[PDB]
Amino acid sequence: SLELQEHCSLKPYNTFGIDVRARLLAHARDEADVREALALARERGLPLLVIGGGSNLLLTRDVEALVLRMASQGRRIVSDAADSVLVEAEAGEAWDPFVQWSLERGLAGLENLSLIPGTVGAAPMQNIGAYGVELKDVFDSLTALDRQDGTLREFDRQACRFGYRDSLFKQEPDRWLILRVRLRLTRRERLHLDYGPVRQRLEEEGIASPTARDVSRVICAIRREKLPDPAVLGNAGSFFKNPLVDATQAERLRQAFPDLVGYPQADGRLKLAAGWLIDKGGWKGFRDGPVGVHAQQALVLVNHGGATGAQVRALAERIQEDVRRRFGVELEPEPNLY
Ligand SMILES: Cc1cc2nc3c(=O)[nH]c(=O)nc-3n(C[C@H](O)[C@H](O)[C@H](O)COP(=O)(O)OP(=O)(O)OC[C@H]3O[C@@H](n4cnc5c(N)ncnc54)[C@H](O)[C@@H]3O)c2cc1C
Ligand SMILES: NC(=O)c1ccc[n+]([C@@H]2O[C@H](COP(=O)([O-])OP(=O)(O)OC[C@H]3O[C@@H](n4cnc5c(N)ncnc54)[C@H](OP(=O)(O)O)[C@@H]3O)[C@@H](O)[C@H]2O)c1
Ligand SMILES: [K+]
């Protein structure tokens, strides 16, 4: 209540840098804050919109809701037994510093997820992943507040129903509010060097026997080189999920498009590079007034300054239609659209 803010600009709180207003904005620092905000949204008859760092979020209009910013803090080692180490972070912790924190303690598991923006609390929503690692690979459990009952529930790995950019919380939106997250990491050496550029850079810098810290630094360097920093150019990273198609459609697509970029899955279905499909549409480097497509990262929609969220969405809708027509493939956006 001391930090509660009315008719307040959300621009500092979304990486896209869209300027719309929140009816109320609350900065929750603990569970007691979260319950006060829930209760107040009830008192006022308002929806509640939860945000972390607003790095996977597209705001398209004034938010007639209580916006609840998760600013809880807290990082600890729960349990440290026989090289297996279980760690806990409060939802409001910044993801990348939590990763550096883990690595500096000699824990391996998160290095591939270095430098991803946002918070710990949002990380399970889309099962964050990069460089062949996903949160689910190290996920032990979380504690979530049931917004139907006001009761707490613990979610173990299976219960979250993790998938590619997916979870129970994305499927049943607006129900669970994640308070904290427990991950199981290791003290023994682990390297997931699946993606060639990581492997390649490590060899160029002459590290034949790398540690999880070396990988993290390499990953940070590649990411810095190639991803637009939101500070320069507002964005929410990859705007679309990579679609999965069956071998039927995959065969038919390949005949029509031999240069097609795809990764066949253990199930045998094919994951297409969304970026390739979009590039083939000619969208790369496109710009219409304040919105555009980045010139090297075809998945990244950008704000050159002053974009409305509606303009961003109109652009994404044009790209989706172009890809449906060209390839018969549906692209799903990744950022949550309000
Ligand atoms: C430059 C850049 C690079 C990125 N790279 C990656 C990447 O490599 N991999 C990747 O997976 N993502 C990436 N992202 C996307 C984003 O950083 C992650 O998905 C991140 O987890 C979102 O966290 P956030 O706290 O900003 O969530 P927000 O954007 O604040 O919100 C995310 C969704 O979760 C909900 N939500 C947030 N917090 C909670 C909570 N505590 N409880 C319940 N619901 C909640 C929100 O309502 C919203 O629906 C990138 C984004 C940017 C800008
Ligand atoms: N979600 C986001 O907002 C966001 C933003 C920036 C970067 N990233 C992630 O960071 C990594 C680097 O991103 P990037 O855009 O530069 O893509 P990249 O590394 O240039 O790879 C391009 C595309 O090919 C896939 N790919 C590449 N090597 C692969 C392999 N060995 N096995 C399976 N698939 C492979 C990636 O899928 P995946 O994306 O399925 O890994 C991605 O769709 C990727 O994992 C990407 O997801 C995500
Ligand atoms: K994204």
Author numbering: 2 to 339
Q: What text appears in the publication on this structure?
A:
The resulting UDP-N-acetylglucosamine enolpyruvate (UNAGEP) is reduced by the UNAGEP reductase, MurB, to generate UNAM. All MurB proteins known to date are monomeric flavoenzymes that bind strongly a stoichiometric amount of flavin adenine dinucleotide (FAD). The catalytic cycle can be divided into two half reactions and follows the scheme of a ping-pong bi bi mechanism. Here, we present the crystal structure of NADP+-bound PaMurB, which establishes the co-localization of the NADPH and UNAGEP binding sites and supports a ping pong reaction mechanism with sequential substrate binding.
Crystal form A belongs to the space group C2 with four molecules per asymmetric unit, while crystal form B belongs to P61 with one molecule per asymmetric unit; the solutions are in agreement with solvent content analysis by using Matthews coefficient. Also for crystal form A, the resulting electron density maps were of good quality, most likely due to the presence of four-fold non-crystallographic symmetry. A strong residual electron density in the vicinity of the nicotinamide ring was modeled as a metal ion in crystal form A. Refinement with potassium gave the most satisfactory results in terms of B factors and difference densities. The metal site is located at the active site in the vicinity of the nicotinamide and the isoalloxazine rings of NADP+ and FAD, respectively. The potassium ion displays a pentagonal bipyramidal coordination geometry with two main chain oxygen atoms (Ala-237, Ser-239), one side chain carboxyl oxygen atom from Glu-335, one side chain oxygen atom of Asn-57 and the O7n oxygen atom of the nicotinamide ring as ligands. The interactions between Glu-335, nicotinamide and the metal ion position the nicotinamide C4n 3.1 Å from the isoalloxazine N5, and 109.3° from the isoalloxazine plane (defined as the C4n-N5-N10 angle). Potassium binding apparent in only crystal form A could be due to the five times higher potassium concentration in the crystallization liquor for form A compared to form B crystals. It is noteworthy that the potassium concentration used to grow crystal form A is closer to physiological concentrations of this metal ion in the bacterial cell than the significantly lower concentration in form B crystals. The observation of a bound potassium ion in the crystal structure of PaMurB provides a structural and chemical explanation for these findings.
